[PDB]
Amino acid sequence: AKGMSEIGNKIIAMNAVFLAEHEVVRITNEEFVTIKREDLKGNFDLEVDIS
Amino acid sequence: VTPVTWEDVQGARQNELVLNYQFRTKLNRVSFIDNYVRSVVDDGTGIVRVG
Amino acid sequence: VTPVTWEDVQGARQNELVLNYQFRTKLNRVSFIDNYVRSVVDDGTGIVRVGWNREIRKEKQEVPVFSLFPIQTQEQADALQQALQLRTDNPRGYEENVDEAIKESVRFFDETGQATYAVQTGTTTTEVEVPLANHPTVEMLNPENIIIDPSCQGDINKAMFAIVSFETCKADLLKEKDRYHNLNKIDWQSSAPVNEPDHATTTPQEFQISDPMRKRVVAYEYWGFWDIEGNGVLEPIVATWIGSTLIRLEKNPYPDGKLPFVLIPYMPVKRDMYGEPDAELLGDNQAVLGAVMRGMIDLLGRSAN
């Protein structure tokens, strides 16, 4: 379970850098929310676990 | 077919009826399934061609 | 029958009653089912033939003719809409009791909307064709009497031709007045089931009928797709020949546009048409079991008692 959580955290950090705003809007038809680049070191606001 | 976001409900309903219709009339559903499982079980793997 | 979309409810109800009625009256439902399962179980696969039956006959009748006059008074004008109301609410009741003159009156109303009286003044001997035996037919074909294209790659839909041998009589062929041609050239002594060992049947080899009309003969049908035009497109056709004489050649009349045969395998084979029955796996077990039973009887039977 933790192995998938480790993968999820890395992808979330990548998604906040390598994905443009419009790409997220198309995937999720909601208002886009941004995250500070220097804050990606710590996962303060997110928790990842299997469903 | 199930929608991903709330605005995709119309698309899911339209495609689901069309997709089920093609397998119901244009194809032998029972024969295809019988060959589908038996090919995988006997040979160890199944290969499906789409055209 | 269940509708696919919301506007198909009326169609589903109408077809379901008609389809059930045909199997209830025109066919032996119990006998067909018994032959349906047993053919699949024993032979390993079942083949069903679908064909329509039509035996319309010419008839001469004295049809009446009615003179048409306009509405003289409103007193009889209500009878026009009364038939219309009865026809919409109960079509069967309208046919049985409403007068023919009133039927002509509403008939002209449907064509033009003019309310006209009908008076019977004369009649004539017309020529009509009374329908008779207009119903579909389903039959189970012996696998030895039907040949399918080997190159179908295990799919009846991709087969390009199919040949089925069946018995018939001259009177049976005469049911269609124009479907067959050059029927007089053939002889009724040759091409008999006695002279056709390739066709399997339960008819005794010594059996025959003196009446030429009811003579039993073997016929071949060719169903498949042929390039009937030089353009290079295949078309579904049906051909029939008896005694090396071609008597029928026409396109497929059914709206389906493909072969009328249905294949049902018992245990399907990977990418193949014919299935495997249960007898394939029990060949050795039955032989071994038979040996044990005979040994037990021989021990008891031959022993002094």
Next chain:
Amino acid sequence: TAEVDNQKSQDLGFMLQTIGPNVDQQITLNILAEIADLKRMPKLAHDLRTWQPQPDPVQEQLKQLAVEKAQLENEELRSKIRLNDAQAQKAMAERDNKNL
């Protein structure tokens, strides 16, 4: 599969039961329409989504009459109030002929 399809219908019924029917007719109709589709009733489902309330003309007149009914009652009090001080003021006038 029938297992998930049947269980989905129960969830729709659970949502319909949990949510008060009075919050919105449209929400209730849409949930019922999905249930009809899961039950393979295309004709019934089409009617539910296309259903509209039947307009009652006499009900609107009675509804409108009640609105103006209360307005006249408020004016009735104001009319009566103008009568109350009129009687009191006239009573005050009649004093002068007594305590002259």
Next chain:
Amino acid sequence: TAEVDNQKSQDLGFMLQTIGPNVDQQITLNILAEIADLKRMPKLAHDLRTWQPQPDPVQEQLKQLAVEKAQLENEELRSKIRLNDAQAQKAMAERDNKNL
């Protein structure tokens, strides 16, 4: 098969029970008509689809009379209001003979 046919009738009953009967008479009648067909009652099913409410003439007159009944009550208040200020204004007139 009888298994699916019987289960289909229960679903129709479930839909009828779940949906409030007051939303539409036509929807309720159509569901009942399908149940009758599943029960092999063609005569009963035909009546349900062709059923119509019986018109009551006296009920309409009583219904219409109630509409105009409220209209007269509103006019009654307006008539009474015109009486209220009339009494007050006449009382004002009688003051002048007192405080002259």
